[PDB]
Amino acid sequence: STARPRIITSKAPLLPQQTTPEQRYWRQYTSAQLVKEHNSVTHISFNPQHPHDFAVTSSTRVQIFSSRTRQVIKTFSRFKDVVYSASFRSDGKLLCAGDATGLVSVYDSYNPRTILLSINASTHPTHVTKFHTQDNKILATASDDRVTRLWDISNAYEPQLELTGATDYVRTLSFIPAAPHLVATGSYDGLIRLYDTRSSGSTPIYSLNHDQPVENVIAVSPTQIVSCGGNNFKVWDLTSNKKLYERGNFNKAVTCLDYVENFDSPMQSALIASSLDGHVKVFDPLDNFQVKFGWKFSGPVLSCAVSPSTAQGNRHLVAGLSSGLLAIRTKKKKSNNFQRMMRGSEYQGDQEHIIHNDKVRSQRRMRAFERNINQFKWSEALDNAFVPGMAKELTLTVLQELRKRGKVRVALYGRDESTLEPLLNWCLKGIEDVRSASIVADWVAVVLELYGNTLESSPVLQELMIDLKTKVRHEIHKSKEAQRIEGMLQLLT
């Protein structure tokens, strides 16, 4: 024997721009909600360790939002002027926040009332305050004083080591994964400067030019750093000290940048870049930085971040917007006597000599049109095909394979005006489209060649055939011109 073949639903050849896989996943990220804020938010930082929370600054206010409840949790608001960068530590314990008066405070996250260690940096503002990732206890801060410092958070009376040699307004710095002692810095004059810190550090080990003012720098490997400023961005191979790539498909300047690896996705790695136009566009370094997906948040955008690679919960994508707006898009994730009476059911055969399963495994259920064509009632197959909410593919399927069985007249004998009419309405839509014009031509051709006199008798079928006439003429017009353009193009080639 043989099992019965299921019907192959009719898949016509693909049209351009098909639902790409990456698009499937990133468009899962949905269910957006907005939060109004007091002022243009600046930096966002997901807590690394138990990644369920994220900090987001404001004017004079660092907020800790939650992740599983997407609401506020905690508020740090003891800052004199507006506060510029907030970032959790490696281990997750501490939050460091630098404000424009020129002082930083590191204090125990999820404990807003212990200003635990206040380090006074330069009297110029300190735009960037980050904790070292590889070590856990050196706070590398920046300033607007064109000089960045590595403080030790044990003793904060003197910058333990300093990095200088700037030109103008350092506002980005970063570290590198496999190297512990390399610090990368980005100013506003191109010129990423890579410092060793095992030497005096006053001079860079080497600089990487970037003609236009950089604004973010991310180590994305032990060997590549992505530099983000002005209209485009550029990724540098670091040992060989040369730029591999440069992608610039934005409009205004990019602002912020983030890179996340090894989350459950068809994309192994992703790099999301954010560009002050609503445009947050997401790229990937295993397909050579070709653009994959994009959201258009309304205003200009200052920051973006996706929740880290160890989220284990509903992941998030937040973007913080220059008129004071957060937009968040989140992807979610009897009797004891009775049992002792009937206690075998969960054995699954561990210590037995032979194991024999032959149970049939259940298919999915069959639709009504497949049931009628399993059991040969063609007339009700076609009537049960023309359903109100039924997929255009499915109506094309039953029309196709009923014709393939070669029972068009047979599927059509019994009919009258009312048993016909919904077919004509669908044939209107079918001739309107292009994948189905062949098959509906077959079906309406036989309706005519079989039912002309009834068509004389009733008045409403006249209405349908007049209207179908005008429709199909206008379809002559649309393939008509479409052949003329083939002439056009063939001359230009």
Partner: protein, 349 residues
């Protein structure tokens, strides 16, 4: 020594069986797993296990065909729509009778069945039949080497059990009769040789709610024949109620009179009779109850008197779920809800 001792079951024993020729035992439960033990006295070892996946068991039967004496099978069944047939050195030959032919609405589950021989009578060829209960009165009879439907007998009311008893006629001739007990008590006796036609019907006296009928004293589905010359007609009939009573008739006089008196009416157990087996030579009736602990009694027949000193207070029995009697060695093998079978020898044999 305990028959399971070597490979302990994971659910209650539901149905035991001794092989009609060799020294084997078969056990099965909702554990889904047939286990065939070689039976010694000292050691009881595993010949074989088999785990039929996704399918329970609530009845196992060894089956040795009577003409061939090589067609040895095991039939197993649970609350499913199919029966498995394992035939009897390294991998298993198992079929599944699955399709009843015109008519399955009369049975949608295969869990209650028996096997028994039958003669064609136009040629003296003897084949299996498989008897299955059904929806309202229906017993469906299938041929057993090829799953075909033979004949179907409706008793009224609801069925509750059915036995088989054979009659001999001449050398080369027997005749099998199917006995079906309504749960109000009205016994119907069809015969199967000519198509299933009602020989008689008589009422069990008393008997408000009946579970379990069984015959004994001759050749049955619990001590079967091994060549046509050995088929013997069963002398005793027993009918066991779900109050607890068990009426006991003699076959000679019940067949003659066709609304007879029970020879003896036993009431010792107090819960619902769920097993009735006779001894293979037909002198002990063991009547047992699934429902409370330690409810086996062994009855000596013809005098219809319960043996008073075994089972005692300390007999480790538990909620007895199945019982067998051995064909030759005089062994008794009992299995309960913990899943442990225990084994005794009636030393007289």
């Amino acid at each position: 020594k305990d028959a399971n001792a070597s490979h302990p079951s994971h659910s209650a024993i539901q149905s035991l069986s001794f092989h009609p020729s060799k020294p084997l035992l078969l056990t099965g439960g909702y554990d889904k797993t047939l286990r065939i033990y070689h039976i010694d006295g000292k050691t009881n070892h595993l010949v074989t296990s088999l785990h039929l996946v996704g399918s329970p068991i609530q009845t196992c039967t060894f089956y040795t065909s009577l003409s061939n004496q090589n067609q040895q099978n095991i039939f197993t069944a649970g609350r499913r729509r199919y029966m498995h047939s394992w035939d009897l050195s390294q991998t298993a030959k198992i079929e599944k009778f699955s399709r009843l032919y015109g008519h399955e609405s009369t049975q949608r589950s295969f869990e209650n069945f028996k096997v028994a021989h039958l003669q064609n009578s136009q040629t003296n060829s003897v084949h299996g039949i498989v008897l299955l209960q059904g929806n309202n009165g229906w017993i469906n009879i299938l041929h057993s080497t090829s799953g075909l439907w033979l004949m179907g007998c409706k008793i009224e009311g609801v069925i509750t059990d059915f036995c088989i008893d054979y009659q001999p006629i001449s050398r080369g001739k027997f005749r099998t009769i199917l006995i079906a007990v309504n749960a109000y008590g009205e016994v119907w006796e069809f015969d199967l040789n000519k198509n299933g036609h009602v020989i008689r019907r008589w009422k069990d006296q008393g008997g408000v709610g009946i579970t379990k009928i069984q015959v004994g004293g001759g050749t049955t589905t619990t001590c079967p024949a091994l060549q046509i010359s050995k088929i013997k007609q069963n002398r005793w009939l027993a009918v066991g109620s779900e109050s607890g009573f068990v009426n006991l008739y003699d076959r000679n006089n019940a067949m003659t009179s066709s609304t007879p008196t029970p020879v003896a009416a036993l009431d010792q157990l107090t819960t619902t009779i769920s097993n009735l087996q006779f001894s293979p030579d037909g002198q002990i009736l063991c009547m047992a109850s699934r429902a409370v602990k330690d409810a086996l009694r062994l009855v000596h027949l013809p005098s219809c008197s319960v043996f008073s000193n075994w089972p005692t207070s300390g007999t480790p029995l538990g909620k007895v779920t199945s019982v067998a009697f051995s064909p030759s060695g005089g062994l008794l093998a009992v299995g309960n809800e913990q899943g442990k079978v225990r084994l005794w020898k009636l030393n007289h044999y």
